Write a protein that binds this ligand. Structure first.
Ligand SMILES: [Mg+2]
Lengths: 370, 651
C-alpha cells in the first residue's frame, strides 16, 4: 500500500458557492452501446398539456414489453463517450482543458450525499480513481422493478422524440401505447467548479423545454422529470422533501433550471404534475422544513472540503502524461470515506494500468500527443 | 347595415364575453386601462376603407385626399385604444379565390344597378388607382409615426398592400399560423383583431391561441367593445360536453367541430341549405344533432381542417329527418324580379322544388342531385381547408345558384377529395372578372371596350340588366343576381391579348408585386439588418436574412426593398419624413410551414383567471372589465395529491 487516507464524513469546509457552469459539448448513447459524440438523436422535447391530467393515465401499462437494454451492457458505467467528447473539444483548440477532476454527475451526487445518507439506505457503491495529469473517477457496477419502470414510462408519456411543431399528429395519439426502454441516453458535458477546484461532469438530461440553440449552451433550456410518488398526508411532505433535496443537487451541480414532479394516486394511476425552478427549492425547504433546507450550504461547504481533500490526500498532479500512473479504490464506510492505492500485486491494478478498463486508448494517445 | 340579430344571440347565450373598451380623456407608451397589454395587432383594413368611402353618418368625405385623411384619423384612434407593444399588421384586401370572386361579382353588379336609381364605391377593389394611392399613403403614415414617436422605438410594422394576393382575413391567418410554427414562439403573446365581420369569432377559435381579443364598434351603444376568445372557450367547455363517448373527450377538437358547424350553416362562398336560413337561429339545431350523434361515431368529425365524410352523412341524414318539420314550423310562425315560390315544400318537396328552381325535367333530377351534392360537399371541404391550412385551389368554385335539400345528402361517403394550388389572377384579370361595365372607368379604358362594345367576344359576362331572385319572403335588398358563371379560359384569353398594347406604367400595378413589407426604427435588429441588407456586399440584392421570434417577438425572412429605398434617403407625403437617420425598411416573407398545422394548445401556455362560476355552467347544462395575460408561472392547475397543491388546498 504505497498511499492511504481517510476522511471523517461530518467535517465541513468554508467556501459559500460554486463557480458558474458552462457546457463543453454532448453525446448520445445508442441501444447498442455505440456512443455518438456531438449528436443529439436521443434528446427528447417536453410535451404534456394540463388537460392530460384529466385522463386516467396508467404508468404500469406496457411493463411486460419493457426493453431494459441497460442490463445487457458490457461496461454499464463506461466513461468512453465523455473522454472522446473532451477529446473532440480539445482537438480544435490545440490545448488541455484545465479541469482537476473528470467524472459523471451521478458519482458527484453519490459523494456529496455521503454527508447526509447512511451507506445502506444510500446504496453507496465502490468507486475507483486514477490520474494521467488530472484525476478521473468511475463507479464500480453493482415489485421494486415496477417502481423503476414507472419513471421511464412517465418520462416517455411526458415527451416527444422531435419538436412539438414538427411532430405529426398520429405520433401524439399513439403515445400511450408506445414501447418503453432504458439505456438510450442524451448526456451533456458540463464544466464547473467549487472553491479553487475545477471540474468536468458528464450528466444525463431528460428533455429540452423551449428550443434547441445550435452551437451554443442549451443548458438554460433543459429539465429533469422525476420518477413519481403520491403526496396526501403530512409525513408525505417530509418524505417528498428528502427526494426534492436529492433532486436539487442533481440539477444544481450542473446549473439545470427546471424540476418537474409527477404524482401517483395509488396502483400506477397518474394524478397531478408540479414544477419548481432550481432557485426556489432552497428557500421552499427553508420555509417548510428548516433542518432539510439548511443542508444545501452544508452540502456545498462539504463538497469544498471533499474536493480539497481529494487534491491533498496524496494525489498525483504529475503533468507529463507520459509519466507512470496511479490507481485507487474509494469507499464510504462507518462514517469514514476511505482511499487506498491499488497495488500492482493485484490483477485490477495491472488491468487499470495496462488496459482500457478505466481510460480509453484513443484518449490516452490524444493527451500523450500534447 | 343595422345591428344584426347575431349579436343578440351572442349576448343571450354568452353575455360574459363582452367588455367595454376603457378609454382616456397623447403619449403612446404609458400603461393602458383595459386590464392588459397587447403584443400583436391585426387590422381588417377594408373595415375602415368602406366606412370612410360610404359612411352610415350623413356627410361623405368629398375627395380621395379627404377619405385618406379620415382613414389616418380613425387608425390613430384604433392604435391609441389598443397599444400594440411588439408588432402591427396592416393586411389590405387583395385578389380573391374564384369561390369568393363569383360571390363578390353579384354584390358588385347589384351596386351598379342601384347607381342607376341614384342617378335619377367599386373603386375599393384591388388594382384600382384608388387602392394604389392608399398603398403609397398608408406606408408614409406608418414611416412618419416610427420616425417621430419614441413610444414605437421597439415596434415592428408589417404591410400587406392590395398588390399582394389573397383575402385580407386569409393573409392574417397565414401570418398568425407561420409565427405559431416557430420553435422560439412565446406561447403567451397577447393578440388582437380589429374588424367589422362576425366571422372573426370563428377564426379566433380556429387559431387555438386562447389569448385573443376582438375589437368592434357596437352599432347601438362612438363606444367600442372587446369580445374575449379567452372567455368563449370557457363557455364552450360546458356547452360542448357529452357524457359516455367511446373515444376520449378533447376540447380543441370539439371546438373545431363547432366552428365547422358555424361555417356550414351560414357561409360566404356557398348558398345556404333551404332548411338553414340564418346562423343565429340555426347553429343550436345542428349542435343538438351533434350532441345526439357523437357517441355513435368512431371520432370527432373534423381533424386539423380535414373532414370525415362517413360521419357527416349521419348528421345530414338526421337533419333530413327534421327538414320537413322545419319547413312546416317556419310557415306556421308567419302568423327583372323572379321571386314567386308559392308552392312551398309540402307538395312533393325535392320532386317539385328542383323543377321550380332549375327549369329541369323530372327524369333528369337524379343526375343533377348527385352532381350538386358532390359539388356542395367539395365546397364544404374547400371552406374548412381554407381557414385551417390555407386555400386548396384559387380555381375552384360551386357551379350553381342554389343548394340541395337535406334529403339529398347521402352516398358521398365513398369519395376522396383533391385540389391544386394553381396561381391566382393578375389585378386586371381580377377587375375584369368582378366589375359591371358602368364601373369600367376604373380600368385602363382599353379593357373597358371589352365590357361594353357590341363586337366583344365576352359581352355575355357583362349584362346591362339581369334576372334577380328574392327568397324566404325577404321583401328587401337581399335578391340573388342570377348572372352567368364566367368561363375563366374565355375571359383570361380575351384579357391577356390586350397586355402588349398597355403602357409600362400600366404593367406596373398588374405585375404581382408579391412582397409584403416590414419597417424599423433603431429596433433591436436595426444594425444587424442594416449591416447585411443595405451595406451589402452586392448591389443586386441576393442577400437575405432569416430571423426568429425570441429576439424581438417576430419571425420571418427579410430583404432589401424593390421600391428604390436607400439608407441615407428621405421622402415626402403623396410633411418630409427624414428617414435617412431614423428608419430602415425591407421586403418581408413568411417562414413557410414546416408541416401541417395542429389544433392543439402549445407547450408553455399559461391560462388567465377563470371568469365563469358554477351558477353559469349549471345554467348551460340545463360581468365587468376582465383580466388578460397569464396568471403567474405554473403550467398546471392545483389538484388533490401534490406537494405545492397540499398547502393550497388546506388554505
Ligand atoms: Mg428524469
Amino acid at each position: 500500500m504505497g498511499v492511504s487516507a481517510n476522511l471523517f464524513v461530518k467535517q465541513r469546509g468554508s467556501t459559500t458557492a460554486l463557480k458558474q457552469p458552462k457546457e463543453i459539448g454532448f453525446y448520445s448513447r445508442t441501444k447498442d452501446e455505440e456512443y455518438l459524440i456531438s449528436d443529439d438523436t436521443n434528446l427528447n422535447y417536453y410535451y404534456l398539456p394540463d388537460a392530460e391530467l384529466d385522463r386516467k393515465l396508467d404508468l404500469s401499462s406496457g411493463f411486460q414489453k419493457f426493453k431494459d437494454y441497460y442490463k445487457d451492457f458490457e461496461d454499464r458505467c463506461s466513461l468512453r463517450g465523455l473522454l472522446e467528447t473532451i477529446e473532440s473539444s480539445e482537438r480544435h483548440k490545440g490545448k488541455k482543458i484545465n479541469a482537476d477532476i473528470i467524472t459523471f454527475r451521478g458519482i458527484a451526487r453519490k459523494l456529496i450525499s455521503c454527508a447526509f445518507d447512511s451507506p445502506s439506505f444510500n446504496t453507496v457503491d465502490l468507486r475507483i480513481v486514477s490520474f494521467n495529469g488530472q484525476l478521473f473517477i468511475k463507479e464500480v457496477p453493482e415489485n421494486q422493478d415496477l417502481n423503476v419502470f414507472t419513471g421511464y414510462k412517465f418520462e416517455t408519456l411526458a415527451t416527444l422524440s422531435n419538436p412539438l411543431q414538427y411532430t405529426p399528429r398520429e405520433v401524439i395519439e399513439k403515445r400511450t401505447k408506445r414501447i418503453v426502454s432504458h439505456g438510450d441516453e442524451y448526456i451533456s458535458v458540463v464544466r464547473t467548479g467549487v472553491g479553487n477546484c475545477k471540474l468536468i461532469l458528464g450528466a444525463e438530461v431528460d428533455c429540452i423545454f423551449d428550443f434547441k440553440e445550435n452551437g451554443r449552451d442549451n443548458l438554460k433550456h433543459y429539465a429533469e422529470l422525476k420518477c413519481t410518488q403520491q403526496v396526501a398526508n403530512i409525513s408525505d411532505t417530509h418524505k417528498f422533501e428528502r427526494k426534492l433535496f436529492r433532486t436539487w443537487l442533481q440539477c444544481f451541480l450542473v446549473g439545470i433550471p427546471r424540476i418537474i414532479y409527477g404524482f401517483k394516486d395509488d396502483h400506477y394511476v397518474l394524478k397531478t404534475v408540479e414544477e419548481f425552478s432550481t432557485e426556489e427549492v432552497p428557500v421552499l425547504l427553508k420555509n417548510n422544513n428548516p433542518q432539510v433546507g439548511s443542508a444545501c450550504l452544508e452540502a456545498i461547504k462539504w463538497y469544498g472540503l471533499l474536493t480539497e481533500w481529494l487534491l491533498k490526500m496524496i494525489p498525483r498532479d504529475e503533468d507529463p502524461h507520459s509519466q507512470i500512473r496511479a490507481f485507487k479504490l474509494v469507499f464510504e464506510n462507518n462514517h469514514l470515506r476511505l482511499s487506498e492505492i491499488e497495488e500492482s500485486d493485484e490483477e485490477y491494478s495491472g488491468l487499470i494500468d495496462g488496459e482500457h478498463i478505466l481510460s480509453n486508448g484513443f484518449k490516452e494517445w490524444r493527451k500523450s500527443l500534447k | 347595415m343595422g345591428v344584426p340579430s347575431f349579436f343578440r344571440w351572442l349576448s343571450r347565450k354568452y353575455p360574459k364575453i363582452i367588455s367595454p373598451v376603457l378609454e382616456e380623456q397623447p403619449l403612446d407608451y404609458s400603461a393602458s386601462n383595459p386590464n392588459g397589454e397587447l403584443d400583436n395587432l391585426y387590422l381588417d383594413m377594408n373595415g375602415i376603407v368602406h366606412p370612410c368611402s360610404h359612411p352610415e353618418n350623413k356627410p361623405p368625405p368629398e375627395t380621395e385626399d379627404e377619405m385618406l385623411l379620415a382613414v389616418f384619423e380613425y387608425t390613430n384612434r384604433v392604435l391609441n385604444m389598443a397599444r400594440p407593444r411588439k408588432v402591427l399588421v396592416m393586411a389590405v384586401d387583395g385578389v380573391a379565390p374564384r369561390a369568393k370572386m363569383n360571390q363578390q361579382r353579384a354584390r358588385r353588379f347589384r351596386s351598379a344597378r342601384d347607381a342607376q336609381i341614384e342617378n335619377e364605391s367599386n373603386a375599393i377593389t384591388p388594382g384600382t388607382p384608388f387602392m394604389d394611392k392608399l398603398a403609397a399613403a398608408l406606408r408614409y403614415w406608418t414611416a412618419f409615426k416610427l420616425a417621430t414617436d419614441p413610444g414605437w422605438k421597439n415596434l415592428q410594422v408589417i404591410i400587406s398592400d392590395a398588390t399582394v394576393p389573397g383575402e385580407g382575413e386569409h393573409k392574417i391567418m397565414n401570418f398568425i399560423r407561420s409565427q405559431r410554427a416557430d420553435p422560439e414562439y412565446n406561447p403567451n403573446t397577447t393578440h388582437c383583431i380589429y374588424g367589422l365581420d362576425a366571422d372573426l369569432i370563428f377564426l379566433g377559435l380556429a387559431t387555438h391561441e386562447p389569448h385573443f381579443k376582438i375589437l368592434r364598434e357596437d352599432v347601438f351603444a362612438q363606444p367600442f367593445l372587446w369580445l374575449h376568445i379567452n372567455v368563449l372557450r370557457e363557455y364552450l367547455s360546458a356547452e360542448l360536453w357529452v357524457p359516455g363517448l367511446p373515444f376520449t373527450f378533447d376540447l380543441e377538437r370539439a371546438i373545431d367541430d363547432w366552428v365547422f358547424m358555424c361555417f356550414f350553416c351560414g357561409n360566404d362562398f356557398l348558398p345556404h341549405l333551404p332548411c338553414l336560413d340564418v346562423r343565429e337561429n340555426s347553429i343550436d339545431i345542428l349542435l343538438d344533432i351533434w350532441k345526439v350523434v357523437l357517441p355513435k361515431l368512431k371520432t370527432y368529425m373534423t381533424c386539423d381542417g380535414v373532414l370525415n365524410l362517413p360521419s357527416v352523412e349521419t348528421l345530414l341524414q338526421h337533419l333530413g329527418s327534421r327538414e320537413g318539420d322545419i319547413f312546416k314550423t317556419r310557415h306556421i310562425q308567419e302568423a327583372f324580379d323572379t321571386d314567386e315560390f308559392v308552392k312551398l315544400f309540402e307538395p312533393g318537396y325535392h320532386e317539385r322544388y328542383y323543377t321550380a328552381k332549375f327549369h329541369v325535367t323530372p327524369q333528369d333530377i337524379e343526375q343533377l342531385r348527385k352532381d350538386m351534392v358532390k359539388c356542395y360537399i367539395e365546397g364544404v371541404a374547400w371552406v374548412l381547408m381554407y381557414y385551417y391550412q390555407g386555400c386548396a385551389s384559387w380555381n375552384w368554385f360551386y357551379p350553381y345558384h342554389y343548394a340541395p335539400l337535406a334529403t339529398d345528402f347521402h352516398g358521398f361517403s365513398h369519395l376522396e377529395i383533391k385540389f391544386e394550388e394553381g396561381t391566382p389572377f393578375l389585378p386586371y384579370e381580377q377587375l375584369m372578372s368582378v366589375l359591371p361595365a358602368a364601373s369600367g372607368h376604373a380600368l385602363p379604358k382599353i379593357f373597358r371596350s371589352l365590357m361594353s362594345e357590341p363586337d366583344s367576344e365576352i359581352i355575355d359576362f357583362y349584362p346591362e340588366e339581369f334576372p334577380i331572385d328574392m327568397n324566404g319572403k325577404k321583401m328587401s335588398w337581399q335578391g340573388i343576381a342570377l348572372l352567368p358563371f364566367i368561363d375563366q379560359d374565355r375571359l383570361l384569353t380575351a384579357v391577356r391579348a390586350q397586355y402588349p398594347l398597355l403602357s409600362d406604367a400600366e404593367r406596373a400595378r398588374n405585375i404581382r408585386g408579391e412582397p409584403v413589407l416590414l419597417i424599423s426604427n433603431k429596433n433591436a435588429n436595426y444594425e444587424r439588418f442594416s449591416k447585411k441588407l443595405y451595406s451589402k456586399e452586392n448591389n443586386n440584392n441576393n442577400v437575405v436574412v432569416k430571423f426568429q421570434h425570441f429576439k424581438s417577438g417576430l419571425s420571418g425572412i427579410v430583404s432589401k426593398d424593390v421600391e428604390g429605398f436607400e439608407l441615407n434617403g428621405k421622402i415626402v407625403c403623396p410633411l418630409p419624413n427624414l428617414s435617412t437617420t431614423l428608419i430602415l425598411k425591407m421586403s418581408y416573407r413568411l417562414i413557410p410551414l414546416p408541416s401541417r398545422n395542429k389544433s392543439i394548445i402549445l407547450n408553455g401556455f399559461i391560462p388567465s383567471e377563470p371568469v365563469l362560476t358554477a351558477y353559469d355552467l349549471d345554467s348551460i347544462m340545463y360581468q365587468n372589465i376582465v383580466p388578460v395575460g397569464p396568471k403567474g408561472i405554473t403550467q398546471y392547475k392545483p389538484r388533490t395529491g401534490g406537494y405545492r397543491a397540499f398547502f393550497y388546498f388546506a388554505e
